[PDB]
Structures are given as C-alpha cells and as structure tokens.
Design an enzyme around this catalytic site. Structure first.
Site, PDB file in Angstrom:
ATOM      1  CD  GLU B  41      -2.697   1.111   2.437  1.00 12.46           C
ATOM      2  OE1 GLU B  41      -2.629   0.493   3.619  1.00 12.46           O
ATOM      3  OE2 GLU B  41      -3.499   2.073   2.644  1.00 12.46           O
ATOM      4  CG  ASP B 106       7.009  10.173  13.717  1.00  3.49           C
ATOM      5  OD1 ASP B 106       7.670  10.345  14.429  1.00  3.49           O
ATOM      6  OD2 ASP B 106       5.930   9.983  13.491  1.00  3.49           O
ATOM      7  CG  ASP B 108       7.076  13.875  15.430  1.00  2.00           C
ATOM      8  OD1 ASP B 108       7.689  14.228  14.505  1.00  2.00           O
ATOM      9  OD2 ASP B 108       5.860  12.946  15.273  1.00  2.00           O
ATOM     10  CB  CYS B 118      15.930  26.116  23.240  1.00  2.13           C
ATOM     11  SG  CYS B 118      15.879  24.317  23.015  1.00  2.13           S
ATOM     12  N   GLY B 158      11.955  15.408   8.491  1.00  2.00           N
ATOM     13  CA  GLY B 158      12.285  17.219   7.539  1.00  2.00           C
ATOM     14  C   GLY B 158      11.811  18.159   8.643  1.00  2.00           C
ATOM     15  NE  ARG B 160       6.176  18.629  14.837  1.00  2.00           N
ATOM     16  CZ  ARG B 160       4.945  17.964  14.069  1.00  2.00           C
ATOM     17  NH1 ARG B 160       4.454  18.150  13.465  1.00  2.00           N
ATOM     18  NH2 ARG B 160       4.300  16.380  15.383  1.00  2.00           N
ATOM     19  CG  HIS B 314       8.758  18.460   6.442  1.00  2.00           C
ATOM     20  ND1 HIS B 314       7.856  20.104   6.607  1.00  2.00           N
ATOM     21  CD2 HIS B 314       8.646  18.395   7.355  1.00  2.00           C
ATOM     22  CE1 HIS B 314       7.287  19.883   7.418  1.00  2.00           C
ATOM     23  NE2 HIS B 314       7.754  18.886   7.959  1.00  2.00           N
TER      24      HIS B 314
HETATM   25 ZN   LIG Z   1      15.681  23.662  20.454  1.00  9.48          ZN
END
Ligand SMILES: [Zn+2]
Ligand code: SF4
Ligand SMILES: [Mg+2]
Lengths: 358, 381, 160
Positions: B41, B106, B108, B118, B158, B160, B314
């Site tokens: 698929e 995954d 993220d 930050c 791409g 995160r 992305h």
């Molecule tokens: Zn940072």
RNA sequence: GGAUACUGC
DNA sequence: TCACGCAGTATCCTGT
C-alpha cells in the site's frame, strides 16, 4: 556384557523411544507385564497416600523397586550383566504396558500419570554427573542455557528476574525462548532479552525434562492405539492386554427403596409408570430427571440409571446416547446455555404443562 | 524557501532526483516473496490536501509513471496486504488483511515540549537536537542487542524528528500484539500533560534501563547542565524540585540560592539525594524524564499505519527526508539537510547519475549501503 | 471434513489389503490434524453453508441458530440483504466469550477483518471431521471412534 | 416434547 | 397471490 549384550542400554533412565526388536518368550512377556503393572499400581497408591516429595514416598518406592527388581539407582561400576538384564526388563515391560494401556483415553491418562511419577522419582535419584550423562545421550543439550553462558550474563540475569538471590540464582537454570512467545513477560519488562531471545526461569530442570517426556509418551500412545488391529489377532496376548488394567496382583439400587417412602406421590407415580413400561413421555422425563438431580444423583449415576431403564424397552443402546444423553446433560447444566437448572417447584408442577392421555 | 515554489519544483525532483531504483530494491526485498511489491500500500497527498490510499503498482515503471503523473506533495508507505490494494473493492469483505510491514518508530520533538526550554512547538535549534541524538542511540542499541534486529534505517522526518524502519524479515512478520509488546518494552516515559512524575523505576534496575541510563549519562552534562540549563532560575528548577520528595525540597532551595552554575546545582542535588536509600534512583528518574525518548504506541502498534516515505519533501521546511548514518550520527545537522529548492538549483547548473552531482549523493549512498546489507542478508540466508 | 471422508471412502472401496487401508487412513487423518494445528488449511475450507426457510427475523432462536445469527449480522451491515431461500456461509471462531459453539458463528469476511477472532480448530476437529469419519468407519473392522480421535490429536477419553 | 437443516425415493 | 408427495438421518435447546 556376558553373551548377547551391547550398548543398547547406556543409562538407567530412558525416554522409551525405540521399540524392542528381540524375540522373547511368552513366560517372559507375562512376567514383565505383571511386574510393571505391580510397579505402576504401587506408584499410584503411594502418590494417593503420601506427598510425592515426602521421605515416606521415597522410601516406599525404593522398597517396591527393589522388591520387583527394576532399575532405580545408578552404578558407577560398569554395565554389569545383571544391571543389563534389569534395564532390558524395564524397556520391554514399558512397551508391553503401552500395548495394554492405549485402548481408551482414560487408560492412556492413567498410564501417562504413573509413568511420569516414576520418571520423576528416578530423576530425583540421579547424581549430577549421571544427570548430565542422561541429558547428553538424548540430545537435550542442556549446559536450556548453558552454565557458561549463564555466568557470562550473570549480572543481567540477576537484575532480570524479580526477587532472585545470588546463591539461589546460582541454583537455578533458565531457558531461551523467542520473544514472540513471552509477550506477557516482555511487555512489563520482567525478563531479560538478548539477541531476540528471552531468558525465562523455571529442582526445576526435572519439570522441563518431564514436559518433553510427556509430549513424546502421548504421541506414542496415540500411535499404539492406531496400531491395535495387528495385536488383537494374537489370541495369546489378548487375555492379558485386554484385561491387564483389571488384573489382580447414592446408589441406583436404593432408588427403588426410596420410592417406597420418601418420594412424593408425583415421583412415586412416575417411577411406577417407568418400571411398568420402561418409557416416559417428555414431560415425565423432564420432571423425573430434575427430581433425581435434586436428590443428588450425579450425572454419571443418572446416565447409568436412564440407560439401564430404557435399554429394556426394546430400543438400540446407541439410540440412547444419540438422543437422550443431551437432555440428561442439559438437566444438569452441562450443555447449551449451561445453566444449573433447579428442580421443579410445586407451583411450576401445578401450572406446568397439563398432562394428557398417556 | 518559498512554499508557493513547491508546485514548480516537485516534478523536476520526481523526474530526475527521486532514487526510484533503490526505492524499488527496498520495497521489493529481492523478489523472494511473489506479489510482495505488488501488494504494498502507498498513499499520496496532492495539492489542496487531497488524500488517496489503496494505491498499488505492478513494478518500478508503473510507479515512476503514476508518481510523475500525480506529482504528490506527500508519499506514505503502508502495509503489504493479502491482495493488491488497488483492487480492494474486488476482495470479499474480511478477506482484505494487512499481513506484513516494517516495524516503525516515530520520535517527534513536539512530544518533548514540557521538558525543553530553548524552543516550543515546531521550532528546533542546535541546543535541543541532542535529544534526538540520544534517542537514536538509546533505541537503536536496544533494537540491535535486545531484539536482534539487524537491518535498521533511520530517517530524518524533515522537521520535528526522526523515524526508524526496522526491516528484518522477522520484524516484518510480527503480529499486532508482538509490535505492542516491543513498543511497551522500549517505553519508559509514561503519562500525559496532567502528570508531573512520569518515571517511577523499581528498586531493581532492569538491564535495559541501566544501559539506557549509561547512554544518557554520556550526553547529560552537555545537554541538560550546559545547553538546556535546566537549573538556570527558579521558574525552571522549581520543576525538578517538584519531581523529588518534599522532605529535602527546602534543604535544596537554600542550596540553590548559593549556587552560581547549574553544574554546581546538579552536584549539590546529587549529594543531597545520596545523603537522603530507596530514593537513590531519583536522579536517574529525573534524567530519564528529561532525556528518554517518548514513543506513540499507536504509531507502532497498528499494521495498517501509513508513515512518511524516505526521500519525501517536507511541505513546509522543504528539506528531504534523508537517511542518517548511525556512525556519523554525532555530525548530523537537521539544518544542513538539502532542501528541494537547493537541489533543483544544483540540478539546473550542469542519466542515472544526475543525483551524484547534487548534495543529495551521500544520503543516497547511505541508503545504498543499507540496501546492500539487506541484499547480503537475503543471499547469505 | 467432506474431503477427509472422501479420501477414507476411496481407501475403503479399493482392493488394497485391509491392514494397509487402515494404515493409510491413519496417516491421512494425522496429516489433517497437523494441517489444522498449524492453521495451514485454506480459510475457504472452514466454511459451513445453510439455507433459510423463513426470513431472518421470523426465527425465535436468533442466538441458538448460528446461520440465522450470521444472516442478522449481514442485514445489519450496509450491503444487499439476505432473505428466505438465500444460503449463508459461516465459520465458527474463538472470541473469549466462553459460549456454546452455536453462538460463536461469524461471517468469513468478519474473521478476516476483526483482530480478535480466530478459527476454533478444536471444534472443527471434534464435531466436523471426527463424526463424519466415524460414521463412515462404523462397519469397518479395526477403526473405532476412539482410535480416530487419537489420530487427530484429540483426547481419546470422552469418545474355569 | 419442540426447533433447524437436507438427503433419498 | 403462492406453494409436488412421503421416508429418513443429523444437530441442538427447555429461567423468569
Ligand atoms: Zn531548541
Ligand atoms: S407436586 Fe408437590 S404437592 Fe403435588 S404430589 Fe408432588 S410434592 Fe406433593
Ligand atoms: Mg420422541
């Protein structure tokens, strides 16, 4: 190794994998069969009476093995002729009893149980050296993880198994399983994984050995039951094997009595009709079956009673098991919705199906 | 990068840069199993967020054709089904079943938001990327040591985070239950935004947790004490105080009033905890809560999950989802990843070797090495 | 089961010596057992077909009657409805309900779809193959119910 | 006792 | 507005 011996019987314990190929005498056949039947019956009686780990169990089992002259202790001397003889006995007798104990599932289970018990005892009497010898001769290859690999991952194993002490851990042996089978253990992280295998803990080793043994033995019994027609034609061995299990080495009857006094008039009438004609229409069957369930007649007892009563009514014996067995089972909540149906209450009987002619 | 320029560049890339040969080598897995590539698929996301699935193709030529024709904005790879997805309408109900798929993870950055200072949301910076750098090492080691998975492709998502494709034949035949077991075994940081203490280790540290803490320690001083400065001021170290029993909290506060550097504050916290023994693992719980990867078990549990294809573009950053070399992980920079605009500028500045003239080449090389390893495993076996 | 029985018949009606016949039968049965235990048999071979004399609703035993149950499910789905005279194919599966087999019927598609249903091997080996074979082997000397069950891996207990 | 199936001729 | 007969085997259920 006097005259006609060999390396056919290396160790005392065996898995009974290879059938014997010798030509023995009828007298030897009968003696071996009866002797092992005595041994297995002794095992069963001692298991019922005592705890299998008890010292009384061990003492009595050793006494029986000595009395019947079966291999139970090792000997770090060599394969003495006498020892060979004993082992041969064991090997042949076992298979003979297989032929005796493969006709019916019940029998099979009994045989398996006794054999397992005996095997466990014998394993319990094996010195570590002998134990390893056995584990090698049968290609079991337990060093089941090796000891060297266990020391290699000692700390990992210690931190893997919950509540395992250093010395106690040294006294335990693990098994290697693909992680796809230990899902319930791996998922909460209670067993160490290394290279796709989990190291699962089990004194315990006997258990694994026994598991293997049991598997094999069950398979063998199935095969034997499949090869029964070849033996039934040998009249010499038919009286023995067909009847070895029966070899010397509340009651239904009282129900009628109860019908005299305790039975309420409804059950008295139903019982009188049943004994007069050996057959009851459906309503009578339901009512009387539920009542006999109420008094305490067990499923086996009720089945026996109904079988015996109906067989006299000029109907096939198989017809009963075909038709009425399900009804009898259902009255006891054995099938279908599987509900423990209560006996009819007087209100139900009065307001139940109205009886008609017949 | 101008995203209005996306529709201009997408065709050229899909025509002269997307590595179709190696892509087919991957998804075809040496042809050993018949209909393997034919039952795979795919799903496409086209312009104006138009989504299509149950796309299957006969071979590399058909894929190249239909892809160059559609020019999709997103390409997701899905399961290998019992039949061809294109004909799923023709398959009798209940007889269309997902049967095999790579085991995928995954990670993220957005899932780390409650514990990074930050950036926030989809912003990333060099000061926070070390978290991904930790994850890849913590997870990949397990996958190479605890489970014995040998063919593992790590890919930049791409923007995160990062994806991992575990492609061993054994890993592709794992049931849903086995996948969920694998995910839960690897997962430590449990809980949502409503829970403060997300790690509660037992008295016994499972070897896996010991090795994950060992990996964390190597980086912790730089990531947490130097870069993140998780003890810079009261508004932040109040959290870490909130993560330890109240009994010593006061004792810590005064100490944190006399410390000038967060490294000093960490030393003080470690000393105080050591002095205070069942809590001897509390610093480890804090380190894990600030460093251990977070895994969405829903991503890895289901066989029918569609995940971003490698070498995708992305939609917002324009960066190429390029494979990450495990050895050179410490040198990986998510901001130097080629964008589609850069590689089209490179392409229009000079047949089967055009990509070797762009900055995409070393990443296709890493992918080719991974596929070579897979081929060696398929043969040797 | 049908195929199994057919094989048995082909063995019984041939001219081979009876002993060999029996042996072959045993072999085949064991093969079948293994093929069930490993789940190698094609799913299409696990289906049972039954026709409806009335409409699905008229039956008062929607639970006890399996085929009717399946029909009801189909009518609950979003496809063409099933009416009197239309044959329905169903499979018996495991779901953890601990109910009688008659209440565990399911449509084949459903089995292929849901992730909690698996074919009830036991049932098929115990109430589909064994009965048929036994009834085909009743007048043949050397084969009895017990033996057949044994060859399939079932427990031979409840069979002067 | 009832209910559900489908073989035969 | 409908719909051929009968003989026979196999399976399953009986709470409010
Ligand atoms: Zn940072
Ligand atoms: S139904 Fe009740 S009242 Fe009537 S004869 Fe029986 S026990 Fe007596
Ligand atoms: Mg009747």
């Amino acid at each position: 190794t006097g005259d006609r011996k060999g390396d056919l019987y290396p160790s005392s314990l065996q898995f009974y994998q290879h059938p014997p190929t010798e030509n023995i005498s009828l007298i030897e056949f009968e003696t071996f069969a009866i002797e092992r039947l005595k041994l297995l019956k002794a095992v069963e009686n001692l298991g019922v009476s005592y705890v299998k780990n008890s010292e009384e169990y061990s003492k009595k089992l050793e006494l029986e093995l000595r009395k019947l002259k079966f291999p139970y202790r090792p000997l770090h001397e060599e394969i003495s002729d006498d020892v060979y003889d004993l082992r041969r006995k064991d090997h042949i007798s076992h298979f003979i009893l297989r032929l005796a104990y493969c006709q019916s599932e019940d029998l099979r289970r009994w045989f398996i149980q006794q054999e397992m018990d005996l095997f466990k005892f014998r394993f319990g009497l094996l010195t570590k050296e002998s134990v390893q010898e056995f584990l090698k001769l049968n290609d079991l290859q337990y060093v089941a993880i090796s000891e060297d690999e266990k020391n290699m991952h000692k700390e990992d194993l210690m931190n893997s198994s919950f509540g395992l002490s250093l010395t106690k851990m040294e006294d335990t042996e693990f098994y290697k399983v693909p992680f796809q089978a230990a899902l319930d253990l791996v998922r909460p992280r209670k067993v160490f994984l290394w290279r796709g295998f989990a190291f699962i803990p089990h004194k315990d080793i006997v258990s694994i050995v026994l598991n293997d043994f049991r598997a094999k033995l069950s398979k063998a019994l199935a095969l034997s039951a499949r090869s029964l027609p070849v033996v039934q034609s040998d009249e010499r061995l038919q009286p023995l094997l067909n009847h070895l299990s029966h070899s010397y080495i509340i009651s239904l009857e009282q129900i009628d009595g109860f019908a005299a006094k305790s039975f309420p008039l409804c059950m008295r009438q139903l019982h009188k009709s049943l004994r007069e004609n050996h057959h009851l229409r459906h309503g009578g069957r339901m009512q009387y079956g539920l009542f006999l369930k109420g008094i305490g007649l067990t499923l086996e007892q009720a089945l026996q009673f109904w079988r015996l009563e109906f067989t006299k009514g000029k109907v096939d014996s198989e017809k009963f098991d075909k038709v009425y067995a399900y009804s009898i089972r259902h009255n006891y909540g054995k099938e279908g919705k599987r509900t423990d149906y209560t006996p009819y209450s007087c209100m139900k009987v009065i307001l139940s199906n109205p009886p008609s002619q017949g | 990068y101008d995203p209005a320029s996306l529709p201009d560049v997408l065709p050229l890339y899909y025509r002269r840069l997307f590595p179709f040969y190696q892509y087919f080598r991957w998804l075809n897995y040496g042809g050993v199993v018949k209909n393997y590539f034919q039952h795979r698929e795919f799903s496409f996301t086209l312009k104006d967020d138009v989504y299509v699935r149950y796309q299957s193709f006969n071979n590399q030529s058909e894929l190249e054709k239909e892809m160059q024709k559609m020019c999709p904005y997103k390409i997701d790879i899905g399961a290998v089904y019992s039949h061809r997805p294109s004909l799923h309408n023709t398959v009798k109900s209940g007889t269309f079943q997902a049967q095999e798929k790579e085991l995928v993870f995954d990670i993220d950055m957005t899932d780390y938001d409650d514990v990074r200072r930050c950036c926030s949301s989809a912003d990333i910076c060099p000061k926070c990327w070390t978290l991904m750098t930790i994850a890849v090492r913590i997870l990949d080691r397990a996958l190479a040591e605890d489970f014995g998975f040998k063919h593992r492709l790590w890919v930049y998502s791409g923007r995160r985070g990062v994806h991992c494709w575990v492609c061993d034949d054994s890993a592709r035949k794992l049931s849903q239950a086995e996948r969920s077991a694998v995910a839960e075994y690897l997962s430590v940081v449990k809980g949502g935004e409503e829970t403060i203490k997300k790690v509660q280790l037992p008295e016994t540290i499972h070897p896996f947790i010991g090795k994950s803490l060992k990996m964390v320690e190597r980086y912790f001083e730089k990531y947490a004490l130097v870069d993140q400065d998780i003890l810079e001021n009261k508004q932040c170290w109040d959290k870490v105080i909130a993560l330890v029993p109240e009994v010593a909290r006061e004792s810590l506060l005064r100490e944190f009033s006399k410390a000038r550097s967060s490294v000093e504050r960490w030393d003080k916290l470690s000393s105080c905890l050591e002095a205070t023994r069942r809590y001897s693992n509390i610093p480890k719980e804090i380190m894990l809560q600030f460093c251990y990867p977070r895994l969405d078990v829903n991503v890895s549990k289901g066989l029918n999950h569609l995940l971003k294809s490698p070498f995708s573009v992305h939609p917002k950053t324009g960066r190429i989802s390029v494979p990450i070399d495990c050895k050179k992980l410490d040198q990986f920079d998510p901001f130097s990843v080629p964008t589609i605009s850069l590689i089209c500028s490179e392409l229009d500045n000079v047949r089967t070797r055009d990509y070797k003239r762009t900055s995409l080449a070393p990443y296709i090389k890493v992918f080719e090495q991974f596929l070579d390893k897979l081929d060696q495993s398929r043969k040797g076996e | 089961a049908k195929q199994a029985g057919n094989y048995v018949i082909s063995q019984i009606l041939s001219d081979q010596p009876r002993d060999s016949i029996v042996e072959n039968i045993q072999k085949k049965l064991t093969e079948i057992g293994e093929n069930v235990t490993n789940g190698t048999v094609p799913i299409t071979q696990y289906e049972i077909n039954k026709a409806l004399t009335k409409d699905p609703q008229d039956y008062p035993d929607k639970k006890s009657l399996p085929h009717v149950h399946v029909a009801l499910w189909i009518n609950s789905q979003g496809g063409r409805k099933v009416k009197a005279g239309d044959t329905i194919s169903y499979v018996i599966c495991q779901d953890g309900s601990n109910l009688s087999a008659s209440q565990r019927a399911y449509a084949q598609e459903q089995l292929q779809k849901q992730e909690n249903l698996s074919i009830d091997t036991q049932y098929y080996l115990s109430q589909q193959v064994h009965p048929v074979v036994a009834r085909i082997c009743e007048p043949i000397d050397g084969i009895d119910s017990a033996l057949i069950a044994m060859w399939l891996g079932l427990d031979p207990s409840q069979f002067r």
